[PDB]
Every structure is written in structure tokens, then in C-alpha cells.
């Protein structure tokens, strides 16, 4: 209360430890980055309110370490989420290859009809690129996922990545005028 919003969307970040989930969260919600961030303790969330078609959408973004955890924690994490972002590190091909493992956790825990986006983070490390863009783009298309390469470090495409997901959920859950 105190805040006028039309929608609240819970969105979860999933992906290997180290890919940059927490920095994506912090960059998107509070415009902060930390080069010395460590593995996440417990579960955290932050919120940013954006505007789409003149409606205010509260985007509540959840974060937890990309590591094995108990069933009760993972169920609470996914519960109520209407969007997910699967994150890999464009400089680390093993993280990208593990995306199918994250897709599996998603299918196993997520509510019906969640919007899914794939993010290749750390695009500022293109001098050490291990994952070709066209390969990742194709993988996203094959699995009906949004796709963006981002850098939490320099802010490149971070708003774009989150906004596109939010706009996609918004599209789904509201009525729209034609012409
Ligand atoms: N809780 C609450 N907040 C309101 C209400 N009306 C306006 N506000 C706050 O006042 C802010 C400024 O109003 P408004 O200009 O309508 O915001 P917008 O965000 O719609 N800006 P433009 O529309 O861009 O100014 C709103 O963004 C909102 O945070 C209200 O009825 N209840
Ligand atoms: N160069 C660069 N480094 C990044 C970028 N994003 C995150 N990092 C760095 O990569 C490291 C890991 O980031 P972090 O956000 O903590 O990853 P995480 O996915 O949250 N890990 P965990 O799951 O364990 O909690 C940190 O040193 C962080 O600063 C980026 O866009 N570019
Ligand atoms: Mg983290």
C-alpha cells in the first residue's frame, strides 16, 4: 500500500552459479553492480515499477544461488511466479549447456503458462566469447523463449531484457485494443 500499480508480476532468475543473476537483479532494480559479489545466501527479491501501455507494472524479481537446494525452498521460490529468466554467461559455454537443466527445474516447479526468457549475460566479455549469439538465439526460438545478450556490468540491454519479458506477460494477462 501507498503505491498505485495495476499489476504485480513475480519473476524468477535461474542459471548456473556465477553467471550474474544477482547483478542482473541489482542492476535492473537499484542500478547497482558489484564486481566482487559472492554466491547468494538464501532467497532475495527486489522490485521495480515500469510502465507499459499506460499501466503501472510492479516487477518483483526473485533471486537465489544457482545451486542444488531442497524441494521446499525451490517450491517456495517458483510459487506464484508468472515469468522466469534463464541466465548463462556468454564467456562460459558450460553455463549455456546447463540451460536445459534449468529448463527442467522450471518445468518441474513453475506454474502453468509462465513467460520464459533466455539471457546471455556478461556481453562485455565478448573478447572471451564461448557461446555464439546465433546458436543461443536459435535455441531460444526452438523453445519459444525471448532472447537477449546483456551486461549487468555496463548496463547493456538489461532494461530491454526485463522489459520484453514484462511486456510479454502483460500482453498475455490483459485485454488490448486493435487499431
Ligand atoms: N497511491 C497513489 N499514488 C498516486 C495516485 N495518483 C498518483 N499517484 C502517484 O503520483 C505519481 C505521479 O502521478 P502521475 O503523473 O500520474 O504518474 P505517471 O507515473 O502516471 N506519470 P506521468 O503520467 O508520466 O506523470 C504517480 O506515478 C504515483 O506514484 C493515487 O491515486 N494513489
Ligand atoms: N564482466 C562481467 N562480470 C559480471 C557481469 N555480471 C556479473 N558479473 C560478475 O560475475 C560474478 C558473479 O556474479 P553474480 O551476480 O554474483 O552471479 P550469481 O549468478 O548471482 N551467482 P550465484 O548463483 O551463486 O548466486 C561477480 O564477480 C560479478 O561481478 C557482467 O555483466 N560482466
Ligand atoms: Mg547470486
UniProtKB/Swiss-Prot annotation:
Q: Name one GO biological process term.
A: autophagy
Query: In Gene Ontology terms, what is one molecular function of this protein?
Result: GTP binding
- Primary localization class, coarse: Golgi
Organism domain of life: Eukaryota
What is the activity regulation entry?
Alternates between an inactive form bound to GDP and an active form bound to GTP. Activated by the guanine nucleotide-exchange factor (GEF) TRAPP complex, and inactivated by GTPase-activating protein (GAP) GYP3.
Chain ranges for the short sequence motif Effector region as given in the UniProt record: 37-45
Query: Is the keyword Acetylation assigned to this protein?
Result: yes
Q: Could you say which residues bind GTP here? A: 15-22, 63-67, 121-124
Looking at the UniProt record for this protein, which Gene Ontology cellular component terms does it annotate, in alphabetical order? Answer: cellular bud neck; cytosol; endosome; Golgi apparatus; Golgi membrane; mitochondrial outer membrane; recycling endosome
Explain what the record says happens when changing residue 44 to Q: Cold sensitive
SUBUNIT field: Interacts with YIF1, YIP3, YIP4 and YIP5. Interacts with the GEF SEC2. Interacts with TRS130.
Q: What does this protein do?
A: Required for protein transport through the secretory pathway. Probably involved in regulation of secretory vesicle formation at the trans-Golgi compartment. Mediates the proper polarized localization of SEC2, a GEF for SEC4, but does not alter the exchange activity of SEC2 on SEC4. Plays a role in autophagy.
Q: What is this protein called?
A: GTP-binding protein YPT32/YPT11
What is the organism of origin for this protein? Saccharomyces cerevisiae (strain ATCC 204508 / S288c)
**Quick one: which gene encodes this?**
YPT32
Amino acid at each position: 500500500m501507498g503505491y498505485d500499480y495495476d499489476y504485480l508480476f513475480k519473476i524468477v532468475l535461474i542459471g548456473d552459479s556465477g553467471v550474474g543473476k544477482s547483478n542482473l537483479l541489482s542492476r535492473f532494480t537499484t542500478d547497482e553492480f558489484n564486481i566482487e559479489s559472492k554466491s547468494t545466501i538464501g532467497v532475495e527479491f527486489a522490485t521495480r515499477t515500469i510502465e507499459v501501455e499506460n499501466k503501472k507494472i510492479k516487477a518483483q524479481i526473485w533471486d537465489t544461488a544457482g545451486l542444488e537446494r531442497y524441494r521446499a525452498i525451490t517450491s517456495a521460490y517458483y510459487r506464484g511466479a508468472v515469468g522466469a529468466l534463464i541466465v548463462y554467461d556468454i564467456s562460459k559455454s558450460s553455463s549455456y549447456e546447463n540451460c536445459n537443466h534449468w529448463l527442467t527445474e522450471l518445468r518441474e516447479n513453475a506454474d502453468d503458462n509462465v513467460a520464459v526468457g533466455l539471457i546471455g549475460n556478461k556481453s562485455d566479455l565478448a573478447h572471451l566469447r564461448a557461446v555464439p549469439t546465433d546458436e543461443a538465439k536459435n535455441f531460444a526460438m526452438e523453445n519459444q523463449m525471448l532472447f537477449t545478450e546483456t551486461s549487468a556490468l555496463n548496463s547493456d540491454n538489461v532494461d530491454k531484457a526485463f522489459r520484453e519479458l514484462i511486456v510479454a506477460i502483460f500482453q498475455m494477462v490483459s485485454k488490448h485494443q486493435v487499431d
